[PDB]
Predict the structure.
Amino acid sequence: MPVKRRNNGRSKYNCGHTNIVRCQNCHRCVPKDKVIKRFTIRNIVDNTIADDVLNACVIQGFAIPKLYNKVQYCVSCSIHNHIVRVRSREDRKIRTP
Amino acid sequence: SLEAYISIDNHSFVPHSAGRWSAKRFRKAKCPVVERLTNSLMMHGRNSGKKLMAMKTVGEAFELINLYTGKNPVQVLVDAVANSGPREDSCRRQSVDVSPLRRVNIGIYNIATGARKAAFRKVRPFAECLAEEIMNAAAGADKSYAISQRNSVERIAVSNR
Amino acid sequence: MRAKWAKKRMRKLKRKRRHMKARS
Amino acid sequence: EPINARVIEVLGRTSSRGGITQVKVEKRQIIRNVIGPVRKDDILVLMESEREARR
Amino acid sequence: GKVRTKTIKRAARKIVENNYESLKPKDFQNNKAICSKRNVAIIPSKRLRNKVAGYVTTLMNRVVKRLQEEERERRDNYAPKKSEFDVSGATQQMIDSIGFK
RNA sequence: CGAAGGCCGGGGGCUAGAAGGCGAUCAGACACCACCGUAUUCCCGGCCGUAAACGGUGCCGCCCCGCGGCCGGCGCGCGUCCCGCCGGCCGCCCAGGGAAACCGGGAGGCUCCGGGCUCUGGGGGGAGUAUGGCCGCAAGGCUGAAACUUGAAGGCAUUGACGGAGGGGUACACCAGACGUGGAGUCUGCGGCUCAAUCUGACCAACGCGCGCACCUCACCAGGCCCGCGCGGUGGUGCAUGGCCGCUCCCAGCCCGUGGCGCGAGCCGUGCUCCAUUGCGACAACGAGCGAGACCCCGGCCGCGGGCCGCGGGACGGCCCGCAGCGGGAGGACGGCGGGGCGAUAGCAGGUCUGUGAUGCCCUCCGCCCUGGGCCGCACGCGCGCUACACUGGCGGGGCCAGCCGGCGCCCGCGAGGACGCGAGCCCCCGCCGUGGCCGGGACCGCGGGCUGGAACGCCCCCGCGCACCAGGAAUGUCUUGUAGGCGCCCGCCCCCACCGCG
Ligand SMILES: [K+]
Ligand SMILES: [K+]
Ligand SMILES: [K+]
Ligand SMILES: [K+]
Ligand SMILES: [K+]
Ligand SMILES: [K+]
Ligand SMILES: [K+]
Ligand SMILES: [K+]
Ligand SMILES: [K+]
Ligand SMILES: [K+]
Ligand SMILES: [K+]
Ligand SMILES: [K+]
Ligand SMILES: [K+]
Ligand SMILES: [K+]
Ligand SMILES: [K+]
Ligand SMILES: [K+]
Ligand SMILES: [K+]
Ligand SMILES: [K+]
Ligand SMILES: [K+]
Ligand SMILES: [K+]
Ligand SMILES: [K+]
Ligand SMILES: [K+]
Ligand SMILES: [K+]
Ligand SMILES: [K+]
Ligand SMILES: [K+]
Ligand SMILES: [K+]
Ligand SMILES: [K+]
Ligand SMILES: [K+]
Ligand SMILES: [K+]
Ligand SMILES: [K+]
Ligand SMILES: [K+]
Ligand SMILES: [K+]
Ligand SMILES: [K+]
Ligand SMILES: [K+]
Ligand SMILES: [K+]
Ligand SMILES: [K+]
Ligand SMILES: [K+]
Ligand SMILES: [K+]
Ligand SMILES: [K+]
Ligand SMILES: [K+]
Ligand SMILES: [K+]
Ligand SMILES: [K+]
Ligand SMILES: [K+]
Ligand SMILES: [K+]
Ligand SMILES: [K+]
Ligand SMILES: [K+]
Ligand SMILES: [K+]
Ligand SMILES: [K+]
Ligand SMILES: [K+]
Ligand SMILES: [K+]
Ligand SMILES: [K+]
Ligand SMILES: [K+]
Ligand SMILES: [K+]
Ligand SMILES: [K+]
Ligand SMILES: [K+]
Ligand SMILES: [K+]
Ligand SMILES: [K+]
Ligand SMILES: [K+]
Ligand SMILES: [K+]
Ligand SMILES: [K+]
Ligand SMILES: [K+]
Ligand SMILES: [K+]
Ligand SMILES: [K+]
Ligand SMILES: [K+]
Ligand SMILES: [K+]
Ligand SMILES: [K+]
Ligand SMILES: [K+]
Ligand SMILES: [Mg+2]
Ligand SMILES: [Mg+2]
Ligand SMILES: [Mg+2]
Ligand SMILES: [Mg+2]
Ligand SMILES: [Mg+2]
Ligand SMILES: [Mg+2]
Ligand SMILES: [Mg+2]
Ligand SMILES: [Mg+2]
Ligand SMILES: [Mg+2]
Ligand SMILES: [Mg+2]
Ligand SMILES: [Mg+2]
Ligand SMILES: [Mg+2]
Ligand SMILES: [Mg+2]
Ligand SMILES: [Mg+2]
């Protein structure tokens, strides 16, 4: 077991301790700077009915509301559900989204 | 069972054709329907091949329908082929619907099978079993083996929607 | 053994020895 | 009361073993799964138009 | 499902480059053209010859859409009658700090 | 001073929840998953003093190629910006360092070794244990041996193998089906049992396999000749060997010269497509080779020559549409030709010494031959098969068609077969039987008549006798066009004889 990453697998810079979050899939405790974080904006009605709601609406000029959700998962759940992948040694250095 | 998969105009004076109907995917959609029934008939295993005999078998089942319904035998055949064949199937089994060529396939197959099972170990001949099968499928009667098989398939399709 | 449980076992052993030596 | 739909095009093999195919039929754009060999402009007998195929 | 091996292709390229004038983009003439020993070509079999000619005919109708090296050279040397060089805030400060301006 | 858990005395009590209880799962589940729940979690006053208390990196001071981001303060400049300075937190990185991973704001300035101070280690175990001491309410903490045992433990890195790891492909492996096998009788091989011997090899890749056992074969048993009536040696050892075969694998894989990287084991060379390391295109690699393909055999259609065989033509992803190549049409005998042969580098203690005058080393002088017997003996369990269980059938009479290439005339005889001479079945048609283990099925047994051969125990024919079997449990195999299945025919071993294999 040598060192695998320069950040030790987290984003902790000039502090001793950080907050705890609960994984939204399995509910384990994870430090906040380690948890995998994604933000999503979606429509409350699925796009496959997004025009039939609209055509059956009495209010003139209505606009379909949206949902704003920040999903946070642990390492195990992120790998299992394919939010992140295991990468090659060269590829691990890439930070591009 | 559509007009685009039941071939009427391509028939000959007897169903024998020596045709390579299964060399391509959709070629058999232009295969004459009485010959398709003839091909299904010689499917017991001790009767593989033996097409010359099956042509007689079907041929003498058209002089029984003309003497009972009083109508054209080929027409009642088309009616039986259309009536049989599940419209809905089940394949965590969820419901799906069936293509035309498969509806025709399963229909012809179950008519042949019904006659086959009803003639084994019986005095009654296999040709006059085919007469019963064809005249009873085309109507819709529950005594038809193809219609009961269809109903079973559609019930299991409904319970899996 | 996992070293944590070996330590637990050893602590139970030492406490048993102290209790037995307490008599007399 | 079953209805007659008509395949507008073929989208691909769905199940883990081939089998069924996803098709667009038709004034709608309903997507459904079929077991048999479907070409274009085939007529299907739908028992209901209510259910739509996944994905 | 018929992928030409490098052996077909490497011979087909020298054949098309050497005999550009002889090869029409139609196949029978090239079948004859992959036969002569004066346009020297030792093809030790007729199936092989047919495959090579099938790739040669295809190479022919790709150069339409040597004659394209004479003109490429004869267009790299043309000097027009112009010279192609006939506002500033910081370079002005540099021409004053060099010379006349 | 000191996370969390824990302790003493008060208070409070939502949530979650050690312990405990209960529902599942499972061979078991005292666990994982579900449900209920005590201490605890929160406040006050104390105690305890430990964590992967981590940057696994002590503190102060100096020098140190550069390119960026963010935070706080200040200063100059234009007209928010822009360039600096100090202090902090980060990323990349030339040199240098190092066993390397990596560090580089040091882990640099160090075998060319010396700025100051404090702490800790000296192969692996025993052991952070015993004992003594101090501290603590306790749980503990701090300090901390020896006898004895052992040849390695450990670090970082390379290639492979494997993964209930991710990603990309693929095959009758599955899908949709067909035909079966496993249940009955029976042929044959195997194990066991028996025996004077029932000679022996092999356990996906052993078990209709080592090309048809009356003698011979023959290795085995009971007797008997030779040199009743060295020389040999199928002796051993395929774990001492050659050669041939099988298998990994019909998988797409292997590998060289010069250059480049590393102390070195090694590495480089070595996305879109195709059956394919087949190709396009890109690249610290450039250029070659093997395997693939090409090649050989067969068969479809057409010409010249001979008298059908033997010499050539023919098809190429070539044409036309839609987007190296995937699709859809067309003509044509054939459409992406089809069925076979061959078959890389590296290997496996599969097989074979019993095929040889291949053969080392052991042991026998167990050589060669003759008569008779065994290899086939049978409570029983297995593998490959054959024949059925019927009417889509059984029977009687008639009709008529193959290919691998290939004799049949005349009399006797029910037949089987003999003495004497010379150059196809299925299927179709017409009848019979009538759902009854019946006229389905033909094993077992009882007389006869023949053939082979020195010799039946081998095989054939005739009459009679008419078993089990009503479609087969748990399981299980093969297959995509002249294909599955059905039907027969021929050759091989062969005195006779196929339920076998090659066709
Ligand atoms: K380690
Ligand atoms: K470590
Ligand atoms: K971490
Ligand atoms: K921070
Ligand atoms: K922070
Ligand atoms: K993240
Ligand atoms: K985790
Ligand atoms: K530890
Ligand atoms: K421990
Ligand atoms: K512990
Ligand atoms: K404290
Ligand atoms: K604490
Ligand atoms: K406590
Ligand atoms: K509470
Ligand atoms: K509380
Ligand atoms: K606790
Ligand atoms: K519990
Ligand atoms: K347990
Ligand atoms: K457990
Ligand atoms: K609860
Ligand atoms: K407690
Ligand atoms: K409490
Ligand atoms: K807590
Ligand atoms: K609390
Ligand atoms: K504490
Ligand atoms: K430690
Ligand atoms: K750490
Ligand atoms: K220190
Ligand atoms: K700032
Ligand atoms: K700043
Ligand atoms: K600050
Ligand atoms: K600032
Ligand atoms: K600032
Ligand atoms: K600043
Ligand atoms: K500074
Ligand atoms: K600074
Ligand atoms: K700074
Ligand atoms: K810093
Ligand atoms: K110190
Ligand atoms: K220390
Ligand atoms: K220390
Ligand atoms: K220490
Ligand atoms: K003590
Ligand atoms: K005390
Ligand atoms: K006490
Ligand atoms: K206490
Ligand atoms: K105590
Ligand atoms: K104590
Ligand atoms: K103590
Ligand atoms: K080690
Ligand atoms: K270690
Ligand atoms: K270790
Ligand atoms: K270690
Ligand atoms: K290394
Ligand atoms: K090493
Ligand atoms: K075999
Ligand atoms: K270089
Ligand atoms: K080197
Ligand atoms: K390289
Ligand atoms: K490379
Ligand atoms: K290499
Ligand atoms: K590579
Ligand atoms: K490369
Ligand atoms: K000739
Ligand atoms: K000739
Ligand atoms: K050509
Ligand atoms: K040998
Ligand atoms: Mg304190
Ligand atoms: Mg609660
Ligand atoms: Mg509760
Ligand atoms: Mg400590
Ligand atoms: Mg620590
Ligand atoms: Mg430490
Ligand atoms: Mg910062
Ligand atoms: Mg920072
Ligand atoms: Mg930094
Ligand atoms: Mg020390
Ligand atoms: Mg003590
Ligand atoms: Mg003490
Ligand atoms: Mg190393
Ligand atoms: Mg013998």
Observations:
- Residues 1-9, 26-28, 31, 44-55, 57-58 of chain E lie near RNA strand F (CB under 10 Å from a C1').
